[PDB]
Amino acid sequence: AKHLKFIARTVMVQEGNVESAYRTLNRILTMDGLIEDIKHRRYYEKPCRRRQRESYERCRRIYNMEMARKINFLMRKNRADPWQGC
Amino acid sequence: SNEDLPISMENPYKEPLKKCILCGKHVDYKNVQLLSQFVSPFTGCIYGRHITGLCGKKQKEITKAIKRAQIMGFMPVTYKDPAYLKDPKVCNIRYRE
Amino acid sequence: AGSRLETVGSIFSRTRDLVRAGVLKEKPLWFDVYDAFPPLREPVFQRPRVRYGKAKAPIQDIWYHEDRIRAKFYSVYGSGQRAFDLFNPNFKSTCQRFVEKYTELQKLGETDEEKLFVETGKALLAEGVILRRVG
Amino acid sequence: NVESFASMLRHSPLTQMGPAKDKLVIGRIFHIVENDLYIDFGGKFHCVCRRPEVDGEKYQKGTRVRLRLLDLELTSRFLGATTDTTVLEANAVLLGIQES
Amino acid sequence: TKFSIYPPIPGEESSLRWAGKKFEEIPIAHIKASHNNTQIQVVSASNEPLAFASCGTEGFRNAKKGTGIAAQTAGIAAAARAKQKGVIHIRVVVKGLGPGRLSAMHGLIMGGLEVISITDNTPIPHXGCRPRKARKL
Amino acid sequence: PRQRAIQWGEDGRPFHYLFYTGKQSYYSLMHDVYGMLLNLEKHQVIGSR
RNA sequence: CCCCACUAUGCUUAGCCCUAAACCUCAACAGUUAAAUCAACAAAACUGCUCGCCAGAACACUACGAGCCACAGCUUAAAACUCAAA
Ligand code: FES
Ligand SMILES: [K+]
Ligand SMILES: [Mg+2]
Ligand SMILES: [Mg+2]
Ligand SMILES: [Mg+2]
Ligand SMILES: [Mg+2]
Ligand SMILES: [Mg+2]
Ligand SMILES: [Mg+2]
Ligand SMILES: [Mg+2]
Ligand SMILES: [Mg+2]
Ligand SMILES: [Mg+2]
């Protein structure tokens, strides 16, 4: 309200490509967490429920990052069989 | 006994521990140029340490400095000051097209 | 008649006992050899346990006095552009050549570390060795 | 005057090398599977490097090559594991061929 | 010069122009994309109203006021009244995630207006009023 | 059915060195083919089914 | 259940009331990783020491008594009848 306008969340259109400008803006708001924050703010999440989800999300990220690391590590040996026939 | 036996000591080949870009430097709430490097250009959102690469201590100092600078009249809240858009990009985030 | 309780004693103890009890009419072909030339440890099943609290493995890191010289040499001059040949058991790298000269000069009575390191580089340069400082 | 094991270990090139990260070593191709080169460089485990695009035909069984070592044994401990997972191979980057 | 998605900053000396007008002088299309309606007001850089259209003013009612085709129709209507007043280039400021958020912008273009920038001003409270309780459906 | 004669003599020693695999003939063939592939490296359709 | 409006209430102040799945459902302190690793599951298995607590189910977060700014309240907390399970 008290800030300058046309600086925050503002994307310029290139060569009249408004679809790409809108997608860029949508990607910015998504990465910064705004799109998902507006949605969660439509109805009140009860504090006990917010902690449960924030803890589930935190643990799914740790589990997915750890499962990706394991697959990358064990994919080094995906090469062809060096001792075929034995 | 025997001269060629191993000897007890600390690892001589040990490498120094990693350091964040701001390790050893004072973070002041008046240094808005530095603080602006860790907020989103479009939304002013403070970046998490997974984007800034800062350690827990400096992530906290930067966060506390930003919050102080914002409410004391030194730093905008809803966007990165456009004067600082051409500063070195030290954050691991890719936005445009 | 026998025993397949592999976690109860060892094949020797189980075999010896059943021979005494008359369960085994004949000793197996290996029994007399084991008795004459037994292993250092009797092969008894054990369950490996996980360490907790203040329990730590007794294995020690292998270090040598020359490792301090090697750590400094790699920091100052980096790894030599010459390639290690680990197949030759008598291979000498630039670092090992540096360490040997560094050891000789220390035995000549010099005790300073920063001075004993600069004089060593000069000696090798005189001998034709290439020492390109990393920085 | 029989050399002890402690003496062999102290004066072995592998001991003298120190850490293996970013160390240039000479390897020998001992097994080839398509474009996968299996190279022994004097360690416990071989490394596997893909045939270079340039002068690919020069890399044959017995060809001696230059490597930049990264790890002598690729191992990692994953969450909920009591020991380390090992792929039983060294990590190295193939630079080229060694010539006299 | 390379294209910058960042808008020109007022007070600096930019070379960008639209019909000889600077970014600060281009009229603004304010799109309110609600869940059940879409409202579009075009104003001048001095905040003079030039055109207004919403799905309700275009004859859509009740569950029809909140669709993509209804917002697109409202955009065309606002573009027509704005074009008569001399508007060609507009800056779009959209607040809300309703169904007419993007469709309302298309209608403005089909109506003859050229969008030079897009700004989101969806209200996000930084801690604010407590929202209503979840609907039990 | 040509079940092979007892695969060991009177002393009980099997004749074939791969007896204890249970598939000595199959693995003896795989061993011979794998060995030929090795020797070639050291050295280096419609008609039938 | 959905929509609209609105109240006690959520806030502040000054007093009360004293409850929770008040739960890491893990008492405090100290020690150990060797023995047998260990009913099961949870959350690797234990030792010393101390306090608190428990002794079939249900009756029963009940009755009576007592105390309490509590008055349709809280704390402490039975018995009879009944069952061969819980
Ligand atoms: S790593 Fe030292 S302060 Fe961040
Ligand atoms: K709980
Ligand atoms: Mg009220
Ligand atoms: Mg308040
Ligand atoms: Mg709680
Ligand atoms: Mg206590
Ligand atoms: Mg068990
Ligand atoms: Mg009872
Ligand atoms: Mg109660
Ligand atoms: Mg009561
Ligand atoms: Mg009473």
Q: How far is B92 from chain C (nearest CA, A)?
A: 29
Ligand 1 pocket: which of B57, B61, B62, B90 to mutate (most atoms within 8 A of CB): B57
Crossing angle (nearest 10°) for helices E68-84 and E100-110: 40
Confirm or reject: Cβ of B51 under 6 Å from ligand 1.
Answer: no
D50 interaction partners in chain A (CB closer than 8 Å): none
- Chain G nucleotides with an atom closer than 7 Å to a protein C-beta: 1-3, 10, 32-37, 44-45
What are D64's strand-pairing partners?
Answer: D28
**Structural contact between residues C85 and D41, judged by C-beta atoms closer than 8 angstroms:** no
CA C43 to C1' G34, in angstroms, rounded, equals 20
**Structural contact between residues E45 and E26, judged by C-beta atoms closer than 8 angstroms:** yes
Which value in Å is the resolution of this experimental model?
Answer: 3.3
Query: In angstroms, rounded to a whole number, what is the distance separating the alpha carbons of residues D42 and A75?
Result: 25
Query: In angstroms, rounded to a whole number, what is the distance separating the alpha carbons of residues A83 and F21?
Result: 19
Cα angle vertex C35, ends C31, C36, to 5°? 120
Structure token digits, residue B15: 């490498």
Query: In angstroms, rounded to a whole number, what is the distance separating the alpha carbons of residues E75 and E112?
Result: 10
* Residue partners of B65: CB distance under 8 A and separation at least 6: B27, B28, B29, B31, B35
Q: How was this structure determined?
A: cryo-EM
Q: Give strand ranges (E) for E11-72.
A: 28-33, 38-43, 49-54
**Residue C91 to residue D23, Cβ atoms within 8 A:** no
Ligand having the closest approach to the CA of B17 = 1
**Alpha helix stretches (DSSP H) within chain E:** 68-84, 100-110
The dihedrals phi and psi of E75, each to the nearest 5 degrees, come to -65, -45
**Structural contact between residues E127 and A37, judged by C-beta atoms closer than 8 angstroms:** no
**Alpha helix stretches (DSSP H) within chain C:** 11-20, 31-36, 65-77, 94-107, 113-126
Crossing angle (nearest 10°) for helices C94-107 and C113-126: 120
**Structural contact between residues E116 and E109, judged by C-beta atoms closer than 8 angstroms:** no
3-state SS assignment for residue C19: helix
Pairing between β-strand D85-86 and β-strand D91-97 as defined by DSSP bridges = unpaired
Q: How far is F37 from chain A (nearest CA, A)?
A: 9
Closest CA relative to residue E83, chosen from E25, E29, E18, E24: E29
How far is the CA of C64 from the CAs of C53, C73, C124, D19, in angstroms?
30, 15, 23, 14
| Buried/exposed B40-64: b ≥16 CB within 10 Å, e otherwise | bbbbbbbbebeebbbbeebbebbbe
Burial of D63 (0-12, 13-18, 19+ CB in 10 A): middle
Query: In angstroms, rounded to a whole number, what is the distance separating the alpha carbons of residues C90 and C88?
Result: 5
